[PDB]
Structure 1
Amino acid sequence: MIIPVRCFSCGKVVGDKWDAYLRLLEEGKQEGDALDELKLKRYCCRRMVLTHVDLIEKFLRYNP
């Protein structure tokens, strides 16, 4: 259901990190590290993407 602008817990933005992440996966095969480099330190902002379930993808396969 798309990524959440700003993390609930602390507030830090997290909109941009999406495409970046899904790439550092496909190729560079990371998790922990990718994130670390994406500047996502403390678990609070962290859990947002790693727990995000992009439903929108299946929805987009729908007509209107």
Structure 2
Amino acid sequence: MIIPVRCFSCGKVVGDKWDAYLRLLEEGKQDALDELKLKRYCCRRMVLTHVDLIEKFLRYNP
């Protein structure tokens, strides 16, 4: 259901960071968050917990 712009908790942006993350996994085989600059758990949990449904929604036709 898409990535959440900015973390609820503190506010730091986080929209861009989605692809960077989902990438540092598939390839660089990796911590990811830490380098993506996601320090304190508030924003941490943001990314590390997103379940991107939009993908499946997108699998629908018209």
Identity of aligned residues (%): 100
Normalised by the length of structure 1, the TM-score is 0.91
CA RMSD after TM alignment: 0.8
Query: Any unmatched runs of 5+ in structure 1?
Result: none
TM-score normalised by structure 2 residue count: 0.93
Runs of 4+ residues deviating >4 angstroms: none
Structure 2 stretches lacking a partner, 5+ long: none
Question: Deviation per CA, 1:10-49, whole angstroms, max 9, x where unpaired?
Answer: 000000001100110001121xx21111111100001011
**SS of 1:53's equivalent?**
coil
Give the aligned length.
Answer: 62
